[PDB]
């Protein structure tokens, strides 16, 4: 028994419609997408940064590794 012992609530009214009287995915352009954009916007500069930073470190380290595999001509300039 967990329903009926949860919280002491007073003076709140709620109105709801049967699922058959309404649409499943309403106002995709006027409400949905705008919000999706809103949500993306509000988070991008919190998530993206460290991932971008990770990428850079990855690129540097990968290139720096391949670069150390190449030969430096300055080791054979007097090997006549």
């Amino acid at each position: 028994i967990h329903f009926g012992n949860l919280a002491r609530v007073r003076h709140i009214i709620t109105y709801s419609l049967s699922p058959f009287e309404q649409r499943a995915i309403p106002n995709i352009f006027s409400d949905a997408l705008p919000n999706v954009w809103r949500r993306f916007s509000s988070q991008v500069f919190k998530v993206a940064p460290p991932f971008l930073g990770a990428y850079l470190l990855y690129s540097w380290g990968t290139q720096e590794f391949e670069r150390l595999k190449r030969k430096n001509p300055a080791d054979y300039e007097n090997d006549q």
């Binding site: 009926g4 009214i13 109105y15």
Partner: protein, 112 residues
Amino acid sequence: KEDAVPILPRCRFTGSEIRARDDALPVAHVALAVEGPGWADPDNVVLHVANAIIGRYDRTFGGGKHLSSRLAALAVEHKLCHSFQTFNTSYSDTGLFGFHFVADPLSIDDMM
């Protein structure tokens, strides 16, 4: 115009709910109904017979656990509610066929 009886615009029924919560009230009330046919329909006769099978109850019915109404018997056996009633409220073009009951917070679910 003066001696013509005006036909009223029809009222659209909506399956839906409204919950007015106040835990400070001693008992909860719940009414549930589907759309009825309206005065002119003969079915109203059958609907009323139907409501008679289910009937009504209230803690002062002496018949108690032996009442013929199954819902009534159950309400008694399991202390399901303080009372309940069926109804078939008719109107010209529509109506409300349902039931209403009064129960303690912790027995609403079983009653329903």
